[PDB]
Amino acid sequence: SGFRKMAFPSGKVEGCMVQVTCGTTTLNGLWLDDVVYCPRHVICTSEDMLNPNYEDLLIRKSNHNFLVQAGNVQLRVIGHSMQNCVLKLKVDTANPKTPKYKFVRIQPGQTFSVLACYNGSPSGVYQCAMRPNFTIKGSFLNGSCGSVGFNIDYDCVSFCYMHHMELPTGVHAGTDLEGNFYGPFVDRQTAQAAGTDTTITVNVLAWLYAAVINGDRWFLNRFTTTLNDFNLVAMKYNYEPLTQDHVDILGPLSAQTGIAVLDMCASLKELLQNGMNGRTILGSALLEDEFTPFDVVRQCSGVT
Amino acid sequence: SGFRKMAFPSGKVEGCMVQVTCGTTTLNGLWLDDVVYCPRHVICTSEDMLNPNYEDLLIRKSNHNFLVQAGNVQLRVIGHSMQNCVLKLKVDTANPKTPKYKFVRIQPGQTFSVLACYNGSPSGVYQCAMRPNFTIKGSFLNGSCGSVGFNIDYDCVSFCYMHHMELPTGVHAGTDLEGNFYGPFVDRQTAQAAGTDTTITVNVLAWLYAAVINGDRWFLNRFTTTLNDFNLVAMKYNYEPLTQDHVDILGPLSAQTGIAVLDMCASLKELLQNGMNGRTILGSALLEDEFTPFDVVRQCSGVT
Ligand SMILES: O=C(Nc1cnccc1CO)[C@@H]1COc2ccc(Cl)cc21
Numbered sequence: 001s002g003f004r005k006m007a008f009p010s011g012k013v014e015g016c017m018v019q020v021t022c023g024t025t026t027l028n029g030l031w032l033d034d035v036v037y038c039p040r041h042v043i044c045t046s047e048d049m050l051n052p053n054y055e056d057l058l059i060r061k062s063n064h065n066f067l068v069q070a071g072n073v074q075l076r077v078i079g080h081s082m083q084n085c086v087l088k089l090k091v092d093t094a095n096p097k098t099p100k101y102k103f104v105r106i107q108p109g110q111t112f113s114v115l116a117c118y119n120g121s122p123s124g125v126y127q128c129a130m131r132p133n134f135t136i137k138g139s140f141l142n143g144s145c146g147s148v149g150f151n152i153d154y155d156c157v158s159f160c161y162m163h164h165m166e167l168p169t170g171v172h173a174g175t176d177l178e179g180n181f182y183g184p185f186v187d188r189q190t191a192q193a194a195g196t197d198t199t200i201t202v203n204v205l206a207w208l209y210a211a212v213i214n215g216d217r218w219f220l221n222r223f224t225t226t227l228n229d230f231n232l233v234a235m236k237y238n239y240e241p242l243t244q245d246h247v248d249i250l251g252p253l254s255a256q257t258g259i260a261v262l263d264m265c266a267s268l269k270e271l272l273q274n275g276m277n278g279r280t281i282l283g284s285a286l287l288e289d290e291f292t293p294f295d296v297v298r299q300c301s302g303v304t
Numbered sequence: 305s306g307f308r309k310m311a312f313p314s315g316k317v318e319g320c321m322v323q324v325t326c327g328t329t330t331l332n333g334l335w336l337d338d339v340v341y342c343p344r345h346v347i348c349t350s351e352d353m354l355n356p357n358y359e360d361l362l363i364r365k366s367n368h369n370f371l372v373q374a375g376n377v378q379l380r381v382i383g384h385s386m387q388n389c390v391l392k393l394k395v396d397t398a399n400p401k402t403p404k405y406k407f408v409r410i411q412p413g414q415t416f417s418v419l420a421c422y423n424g425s426p427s428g429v430y431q432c433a434m435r436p437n438f439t440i441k442g443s444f445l446n447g448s449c450g451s452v453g454f455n456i457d458y459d460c461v462s463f464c465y466m467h468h469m470e471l472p473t474g475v476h477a478g479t480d481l482e483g484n485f486y487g488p489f490v491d492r493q494t495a496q497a498a499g500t501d502t503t504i505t506v507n508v509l510a511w512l513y514a515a516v517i518n519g520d521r522w523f524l525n526r527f528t529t530t531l532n533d534f535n536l537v538a539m540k541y542n543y544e545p546l547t548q549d550h551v552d553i554l555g556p557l558s559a560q561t562g563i564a565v566l567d568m569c570a571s572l573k574e575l576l577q578n579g580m581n582g583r584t585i586l587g588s589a590l591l592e593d594e595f596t597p598f599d600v601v602r603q604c605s606g607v608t
């Protein structure tokens with residue numbers, strides 16, 4: 001009973017957080033095995049962030065300039081390299097708390113948990129979606145750079161995001177763990193356009209299924225629609241066009257509830273065209289798109 | 305930049321979760337030092353839950369009937385006692401992962417994080433408020449009993465909630481860590497009235513301050529109100545009456561933003577009387593009451 005915006009338990013990731021300091025800049029690093037990963041802009045001053053030449057800035061740094069600390073534990077840096085927008089600091093000690101892990105580049109519309117950190121110390125955990133425009137709407141202040149996003153599949157942490165920047169619009173941008181930005185962003189203090197964003201249709205439908213499962217059913221109607229008709233409505237309301245691949249991933253929810261995917265699309269069509277009429281769905285007065293169909297299945301079945 | 309419903313990092317609590325089995329019933333326990341705490345209904349069958357005589361049911365149980373497991377680790381039970389609605393199982397080994405901790409009974413309107421667990425394994429973490437009627441609107445399925453709610457103040461975990469029951473309305477009830485229920489509830493399968501609930505006014509005001517801090521300002525107006533006038537509106541809309549104690553705790557947010565508490569009350573008054581007019585505040589289309597003023601200060605300053 002009930003449905004919440006749930007994050008993965010963060011313990012496995014907390015054990016990996018370290019503080020990295022280079023010169024006067026301090027941010028967070030991720031210590032996995034004998035490597036610490038962090039945003040390459042740890043090597044910049046504020047003066048450098050205008051248009052940093054990272055290759056030249058890194059050439060002025062030696063292993064001993066990267067101060068890495070995990071609480072009392074001071075790590076000895078024996079190598080450094082830049083890969084895209086991340087620095088990889090080789091340390092002489094493998095992290096004893098390294099969980100089973102993978103580095104994954106997530107697709108837009110997928111969800112993940114963020115462990116917000118400051119000075120290498122975890123402050124909170126929240127779940128969010130990678131927007132279709134490759135930004136995330138997080139909660140990050142100065143010092144949060146290097147905080148990571150992840151998913152967990154039994155004992156394996158799949159790291160998918162490392163925080164780098166807040167855009168002038170207040171939304172967030174970052175990279176995968178190989179240092180490649182999600183979206184068109186560059187690690188420089190310049191105003192940068194985030195694309196037109198859309199609502200993640202398949203996630204809204206998944207959440208409507210979660211609502212029916214939990215007893216919020218008022219939005220179910222006597223109608224049906226087609227993918228074509230539904231996509232005309234999706235385009236009008238800036239929703240992602242629904243494909244057969246999205247219908248296929250909604251199969252388990254359709255099977256469990258007995259509500260055909262296109263019938264749920266007709267409920268979503270009516271909600272887009274008429275609004276919620278002052279009512280709520282799972283405690284929300286808007287259509288929620290931060291739950292994937294897999295998240296709904298996991299939460300509704302009790303997966304650990 | 306940004307404001308999210310953030311939970312505390314759950315690692316310190318994950319290290320305390322164990323599975324407790326008595327007969328055919330399995331639920332979660334909390335292993336702190338050499339004691340495992342769990343709901344006393346672990347000693348019931350479904351047949352017993354109608355009107356259990358817990359004293360008589362526990363008399364039929366010996367230490368060896370309580371099977372406590374923490375992954376591979378099997379714990380040896382050397383004592384058992386019932387305190388209110390919790391069982392305390394003394395084990396021969398202190399939990400090496402016991403964090404610094406306290407047991408606290410929270411007040412209605414306070415917030416905390418829940419680590420939802422099944423079979424002693426953590427599945428997710430979310431933040432919620434203890435409703436003014438002493439229920440919580442969580443996400444719990446069968447097997448989640450014994451999952452705990454907590455807050456963290458630097459290195460100290462204050463445990464405040466242990467999950468026991470889902471009411472027929474789909475809301476949740478549980479106890480403090482001394483086994484005293486929050487609210488009028490009893491651990492028996494009988495339909496039980498949860499009181500009339502109200503919206504946590506001081507938390508809505510705190511969240512409006514968080515909104516202004518983050519740039520959502522459209523709801524600020526040219527008006528002011530008084531505590532008396534505001535409380536007539538609060539009563540009409542089923543909000544908690546605002547007191548000077550609530551105004552006092554909003555002091556830091558008022559000081560930081562320069563918006564007097566009674567001016568923010570006039571914005572809240574206009575939102576109650578006129579609705580949101582199809583607009584949103586911090587990504588919500590309703591007035592959010594699950595952030596306390598302390599939560600807003602912590603999140604807006606970056607506390608670890
Ligand atoms: O954005 C930043 N930090 C930040 C991140 N998240 C949240 C807040 C902040 C600073 O208030 C810094 C300041 O400007 C740049 C430009 C490029 C990069 Cl890669 C990083 C930064």
Ligand SMILES: O=C(Nc1cnccc1CO)[C@@H]1COc2ccc(Cl)cc21
Pocket residue numbers: 001345353444445446447448449468469470471490491492493494
């Ligand atoms: O409520 C329960 N479990 C539960 C909790 N949270 C979520 C779901 C469930 C079961 O679906 C069980 C079944 O009925 C009773 C009556 C009294 C108590 Cl103390 C416990 C229980």
